[PDB]
Design a protein around this ligand. Structure first.
Ligand SMILES: *[C@@H]1O[C@H](CO[C@@H]2O[C@@H](C)[C@@H](O)[C@@H](O)[C@@H]2O)[C@@H](O[C@@H]2O[C@H](CO)[C@@H](O[C@@H]3O[C@H](CO[C@H]4O[C@H](CO)[C@@H](O)[C@H](O)[C@@H]4O)[C@@H](O)[C@H](O[C@H]4O[C@H](CO)[C@@H](O)[C@H](O)[C@@H]4O)[C@@H]3O)[C@H](O)[C@H]2NC(C)=O)[C@H](O)[C@H]1NC(C)=O
Ligand SMILES: CCCCCCCCCNC(=O)CCC[C@@H](O)[C@@H](O)[C@H](CO[C@H]1O[C@H](CO)[C@H](O)[C@H](O)[C@H]1O)NC(=O)CCCCCCC
Ligand SMILES: *[C@@H]1O[C@H](CO)[C@@H](O[C@@H]2O[C@H](CO)[C@@H](O)[C@H](O)[C@H]2NC(C)=O)[C@H](O)[C@H]1NC(C)=O
Ligand SMILES: CCCCCCCCCCCCCCCC(=O)O
Ligand SMILES: *[C@@H]1O[C@H](CO)[C@@H](O)[C@H](O)[C@H]1NC(C)=O
Lengths: 267, 98
């Protein structure tokens, strides 16, 4: 299960100012960046082009170049038509791509001021239950544009799975990279709070538990997965204990990279 | 509008005198316009690298700031965030363990 996400962020400030920026993620590795500043889509990996030839990529790029200008014009023009009722500032987000399987499903979701309002599904755009009613008319209009509907359907149903299978092949060693965790212990200097820190692991799946001998200490609170800047992950697991009960405790780590040789830090 | 949560943690075990990387991960904010600085002894650190802004399944934004640092027992490190959701800048000092 790999999920390809293209994440577009548009800020509209007043009528004379807007930017659109995008990032693309294959699973948890960033594959592309597309700044407002740049005319072209930038690569964040050597394999970011997938199996697409230089011409095939340019054709896809052009289509997105056309889309970005058109999308900006359309949103600017919609705001003028709705003024003063709907007015600046405005934030629009699009999350679009496909989730691969052993087969794939595609999605295109749109949020307005941080709330999900619109998706493309089947052959048409649609507002979602609870969306502001003023979106219904603009979406009907958009649904009349047959060519846009047909391009979007091609992009979702065909282009996305084809392109991602290209990325999965082209970036296999990078996608299947194993990076080892390093761990270290600390505590708040009454009952103490022991913290087992685990940083530098990839991929994401991991097991961190406090132990006394072979007994798992089920009071272990697992923190959130925090990213490092080098495409590895950070995680801490804490245990609330009474003072004098810290002797004989240990933090045990299991990860794919370690080849069955767990990390064990005795407190 | 949503308030940014801020987490500060080091890339490697913090050992005094050993160069390292300090991370500031800012999450769960809206709108995306935001100003993030990392501080050494309360002063702005100049070379602070930044990830591209992205967002989560719930549409809230996130971003990762990072800079080289060397921990010692004479230095504090922090992350200060200015954002429209908060009246004044919010600062989180490095826990010293994290
Ligand atoms: C791209 O794939 C689309 C389906 O995939 C989904 O959407 C994409 C964007 C991804 O997100 C993916 O992950 C999703 O799974 C596909 O859309 C389908 O297109 C056909 C038309 O070509 C639609 O068929 C019509 O169905 C309606 C009934 O729809 C309702 O009921 C069904 C349940 O039975 C539900 O599934 C729907 O949600 C609706 O509630 C029929 O009324 C209609 O029949 C009449 O018209 C046809 C002519 O087309 C005649 O042959 C018949 O005899 C009837 O007169 C259609 O059969 C289908 O609903 C639609 N799916 C959805 C989920 O909306 C799209 O066509 C693909 N495009 C390309 C280019 O590949
Ligand atoms: C306020 C919050 C509202 C959010 C809900 C609205 C979201 C609207 C999203 N609209 C779009 O994504 C489409 C915007 C661009 C579109 O409307 C057209 O202007 C543009 C140009 O269309 C014309 O030329 C095309 C050939 O280039 C076609 O032939 C079309 O028939 C013709 O009218 N359309 C496109 O660029 C379509 C391809 C890009 C679609 C990608 C979507 C992510
Ligand atoms: C975001 O990017 C686009 C790049 O095309 C900018 O759009 C241009 O804006 C300038 C204003 O300085 C105009 O001269 C051009 O007419 C615009 N170009 C197009 C193709 O529409 C936009 O200004 C950028 N936004 C920001 C905030 O930098
Ligand atoms: C919209 C669905 C995309 C399906 C095709 C995916 C392969 C092309 C990758 C293009 C990344 C460009 C980033 C811009 C994202 C955007 O503006 O929507
Ligand atoms: C439009 O927005 C920008 C960014 O918010 C602002 O700096 C600028 O003064 C505004 N311009 C006008 C003409 O209102």
């Amino acid at each position: 299960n790999y999920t390809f996400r293209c994440l577009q962020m548009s800020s509209f400030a007043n009528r004379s100012w807007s930017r659109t920026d995008s990032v693309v993620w294959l699973g948890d590795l960033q594959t592309h960046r597309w700044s407002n500043d740049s005319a072209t889509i930038s690569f964040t990996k050597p394999w970011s082009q997938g199996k697409l030839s230089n011409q095939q990529w340019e054709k896809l790029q052009h289509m997105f170049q056309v889309y970005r200008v058109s999308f900006t014009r359309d949103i600017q023009e919609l705001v003028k038509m709705m003024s003063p009722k709907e007015d600046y500032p405005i934030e629009i987000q699009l999350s679009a791509g496909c989730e691969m399987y052993p087969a794939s499903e595609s999605f295109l979701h749109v949020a307005f001021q941080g709330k999900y309002v619109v998706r493309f599904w089947g052959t048409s755009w649609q507002t979602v239950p609870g969306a502001p009613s003023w979106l219904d008319l603009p979406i009907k209009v958009l649904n009349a544009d047959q060519g846009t509907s047909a391009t979007v359907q091609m992009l979702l149903n065909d282009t996305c799975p084809l392109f991602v299978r290209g990325l999965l092949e082209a970036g296999k060693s990078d996608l299947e990279k194993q990076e080892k965790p390093v761990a270290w212990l600390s505590s708040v200097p009454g009952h103490r709070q022991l913290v087992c820190h685990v940083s530098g692991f990839y991929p994401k799946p991991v097991w961190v538990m406090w132990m006394r001998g072979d007994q798992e200490q089920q009071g272990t609170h697992r923190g959130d997965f925090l990213p490092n800047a080098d495409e590895t992950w950070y995680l801490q697991a804490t245990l609330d204990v009474e003072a004098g009960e810290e002797a004989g405790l240990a933090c045990r780590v299991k990860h794919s990279s370690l080849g069955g040789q767990d990390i064990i830090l005795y407190w | 509008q949503k308030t940014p949560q801020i987490q500060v943690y080091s890339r490697h075990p913090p050992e005094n005198g050993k160069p390292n990387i300090l991370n500031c991960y800012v999450t769960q904010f809206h709108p995306p316009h935001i100003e993030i600085q990392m501080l050494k002894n309360g002063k702005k650190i100049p070379k602070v690298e930044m990830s591209d802004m992205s967002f989560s399944k719930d549409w809230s934004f996130y971003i990762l700031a990072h800079t080289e640092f060397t921990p010692t027992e004479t230095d504090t490190y922090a992350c200060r965030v200015k954002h429209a959701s908060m009246a004044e800048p919010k600062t989180v000092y490095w826990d010293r363990d994290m």
